[PDB]
Amino acid sequence: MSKGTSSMGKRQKRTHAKCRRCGSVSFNVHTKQCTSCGFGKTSRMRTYKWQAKCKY
Amino acid sequence: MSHNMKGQKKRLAKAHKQNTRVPVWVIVKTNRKVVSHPRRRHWRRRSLDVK
Amino acid sequence: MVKSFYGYVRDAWKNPDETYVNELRWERLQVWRKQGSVTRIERPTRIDRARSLGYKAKQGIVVVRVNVRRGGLGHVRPNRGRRTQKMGKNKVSGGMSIQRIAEVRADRRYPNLEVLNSYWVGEDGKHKWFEVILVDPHHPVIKSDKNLNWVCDPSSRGRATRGKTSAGRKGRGMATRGKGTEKTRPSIRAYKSRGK
Amino acid sequence: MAILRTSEIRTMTIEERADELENLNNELVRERALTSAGGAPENPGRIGEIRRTIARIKTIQHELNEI
RNA sequence: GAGUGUGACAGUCACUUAGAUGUACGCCAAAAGACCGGAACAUGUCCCUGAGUACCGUGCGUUGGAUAUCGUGCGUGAAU
RNA sequence: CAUGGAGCCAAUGAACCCGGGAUUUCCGAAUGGGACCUCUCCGUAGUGAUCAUUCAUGAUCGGGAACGCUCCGAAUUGAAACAUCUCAGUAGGAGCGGGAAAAGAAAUCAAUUGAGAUGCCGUAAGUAACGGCGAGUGAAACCGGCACAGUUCAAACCGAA
Ligand SMILES: [K+]
Ligand SMILES: [K+]
Ligand SMILES: [K+]
Ligand SMILES: [Mg+2]
Ligand SMILES: [Mg+2]
Ligand SMILES: [Mg+2]
Ligand SMILES: [Mg+2]
Ligand SMILES: [Mg+2]
Ligand SMILES: [Mg+2]
Ligand SMILES: [Mg+2]
Ligand SMILES: [Mg+2]
Ligand SMILES: [Mg+2]
Ligand SMILES: [Zn+2]
Questions:
Q1: Does a cis peptide bond (omega within 30 degrees of 0) precede residue C140?
Q2: DSSP letter string over A8-50?
Q3: Chain A contact set for B11 (CB, 8 A)
Q4: Which nucleotide is at minimal CA–C1' distance from D40?
Q5: Which of residues 110-169 of C touch strand F (CB under 7 A)?
Q6: Cα C119 to the chain's mean position, in Å?
Q7: Strand E nucleotides below 7 A of a protein CB?
């Protein structure tokens, strides 16, 4: 069975749900974490310095 | 017949009622300057990122 | 001489293995090992040390004994490219001293309080013990106290976490003035961490 | 002018304010039911002014500690 | 006579401008009152003045810091 | 936004602006419990966790463009290779935290005899110093300015004053 279009017919599920906290469809249904805002992992909002460039 | 909870169906309902044309009177009022909006879609396309 | 009894406590703890404090140490370390990470105690073990460090027998002043492991920065060997100078980590102790680690763990256990100071109270082959003095800035007794009501200011919150205690300033290279403090005062971060 | 002003609401009694609030709720029910059939209202601004009068009555009640 | 608007280029059409006015809550704030109190000297087999601290040994990091940077891991460890 | 129809409001002073209030669904620090369920379960109607106090009460939590402090910490790159070095305490990480933060009243700097808290700027100076003494890295004091500010404990003596 080809790794291309044939295996893409099994895409009848999800790995990420809608996030309560931020509204992004980034809540991992297995790890119970939002990969966008960090909901379900931290009480704070997920932010990294590498999300932008070094400001210089 | 997928099974939605109350909130998932509410978000689907909002997506459905957003998929309407701009009213004709709005087009008249704006002098043909507002004739569309970015939430138009078709059900058989790239699906909703809602549910 | 007419010396206060605090002087006698100080003398007993000057060379503890040569005084009665050695037997107290043998009996106390069993109890202290039985305890956890951060233990509150009614009175300081060394009253003179606590009093010279700012302890007072009043409401809003808390003394806690903290347990910290020995040795340096328990470090993982990198699993990617390093240049043989950054590959080795076994001999790399940290830049954070054990006393300041104890102070910060005490601060973590007591979110509403501020660390005042701490002192050494014991150690064995696996642990060191420090007693940390903490102040309640929102207690009216502390608010009235004019020798302590500075701790109610907005810049005094998170003292131990920003290196503002005596141990923290020792760790920042600001325990002395003059030569050797070119890259330490007014802050480590102010000179690109080249001091320390 | 409007259905009833702030001075009118403050002049009434507690029972009078409650009665007028109930009547305004009834009028809003009737007007919204008429629009349920799709048909245009007989008075398009009447619905909005009824709603704002209801809000004004509720605010006067809350100020007067009735609700 | 900064400028912008006004059916084409505006000191004098409009808003402005220059210059004066006013302003609730606030903020600073001088006179004048209430309060703990301050500063010198003489005398000295008198008392007190911060400890696992300062220092040192050894390892490592860091530093321009070089046998002479700072840190901190282990060990050792005072004086009054 | 956004002069279309039809109405509504406004001289009982609206619109608008300034100040002060009210309302303020659910999720969210989210905090009665549970969330592939932004809802759901018990309803005893909800002080979730960690703490201070006499146990009336109180504190902390999340957010904020950058700045600030503490700690952890690469490699590309340069050296025309490369390992010390450099890149660089950079990038990135963790914690704390305010309108600023940190520092701060010498167990200092000087030099033959002086000055007199700290910070920031100028200069010293690419100097001293380090360095396959290669490439490179790299001060401080003195001095001139901005702004100026000094103090509180522990102890001796008294002993709840
Ligand atoms: K013109
Ligand atoms: K090259
Ligand atoms: K190469
Ligand atoms: Mg593949
Ligand atoms: Mg940056
Ligand atoms: Mg812990
Ligand atoms: Mg400060
Ligand atoms: Mg003019
Ligand atoms: Mg915060
Ligand atoms: Mg090269
Ligand atoms: Mg200080
Ligand atoms: Mg460097
Ligand atoms: Zn999210």
A1: no
A2: GGG--S-SEEE-TTT--EEEETTTTEETTT-TTT-SSPP--GG
A3: 18
A4: F6
A5: 110-113, 136, 138-139, 141, 146-147, 154-158, 161-164, 168-169
A6: 6
A7: 46-54, 59-65, 69-75, 77-80
